[PDB]
Design a protein around this ligand. Structure first.
Ligand SMILES: Cc1cc(-c2cn(CC(=O)Nc3cc(N4CCOCC4)ncc3Cl)c3nc(-c4cnn(C)c4)n(C)c(=O)c23)cc(C#N)c1O
Ligand SMILES: Cc1cc(-c2cn(CC(=O)Nc3cc(N4CCOCC4)ncc3Cl)c3nc(-c4cnn(C)c4)n(C)c(=O)c23)cc(C#N)c1O
Lengths: 122, 123
């Protein structure tokens, strides 16, 4: 017998995004071409297969500054990073290309799937 | 303006954070509760507790790796609330209601406290 708090997880994520906005306990800077992004490694690992792999591998686990592949563009990463901390994704025909490629690179199948559906729809 | 919202994202994030805790991956604090030690992520503690948010909002308190709770706090009560923080689920029983409530009040977790109040009424 347990009590289920329906909004707990969502409330936790809100507060994690609050901490991100004020740069509290952020422990990694993601560099994407010309832009810097600060985040929590734990959240990154919780939302991306790439980051889960990096931060559990003996080569890159302790890095505090990560450089994504040059082909990734900052606009797409910003979108997916905001999704990580909000569960919300702003998808349009003008950014779907970048969003889908970034999500495939970050290994985030749900966004990829949603992108594929968005394409075959329009 | 509008956007797509993934209804299960947050729950899966929390589950993966709990998996990292179980693996002791990127845990950055030890909470000492009488004779017991609990490892955790400050970020989750801050996101779930008014006490932990207040403590760790100080970068010098945030630098600490060992936090001793009030010695009067029951370790089983804290363990129940720690599991709750990482799962959204609270194991409330007649055998533990008093420890959970006192601990929830100490950690400044209103929803659990009020849940315990409703529980005590129903009993
Ligand atoms: C909430 C959310 C999460 C993810 C998402 C997160 N992670 C990383 C991840 O799994 N971390 C953890 C896994 C475990 N394990 C416990 C034992 O069993 C399960 C694994 N423990 C702790 C952590 Cl932290 C993803 N990894 C992949 C992937 C690609 N190749 N492989 C081999 C895996 N794919 C495809 C994904 O989608 C995601 C994506 C989205 C989206 N969109 C999303 O919303
Ligand atoms: C999901 C969940 C959360 C909480 C819960 C979490 N926090 C801590 C918290 O808010 N941290 C953050 C706050 C902010 N903001 C602060 C205000 O504006 C600027 C930004 N930014 C990031 C973070 Cl991390 C709580 N603090 C109190 C409390 C008691 N006195 N005071 C003064 C506060 N009470 C009563 C609570 O319940 C909770 C409890 C439960 C339960 N049960 C639960 O399920």
């Amino acid at each position: 017998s347990q009590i289920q708090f329906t909004r707990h997880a969502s409330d936790v994520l809100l507060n994690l995004n609050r901490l991100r906005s004020r740069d509290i306990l952020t422990d990694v800077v993601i560099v994407v071409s010309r832009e810097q992004f600060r985040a929590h490694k734990t959240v990154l690992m919780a939302c991306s297969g790439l980051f889960y792999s990096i931060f559990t591998d003996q080569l890159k686990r302790n890095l505090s500054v990560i450089n994504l592949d040059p082909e990734i563009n900052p606009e797409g990463f910003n979108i997916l990073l905001d999704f990580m901390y909000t569960s919300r994704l702003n998808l349009r025909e003008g950014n779907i290309m970048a969003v889908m490629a970034t999500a495939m690179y970050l290994q985030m199948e749900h966004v990829v799937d949603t992108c594929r559906k968005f394409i075959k729809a329009s």
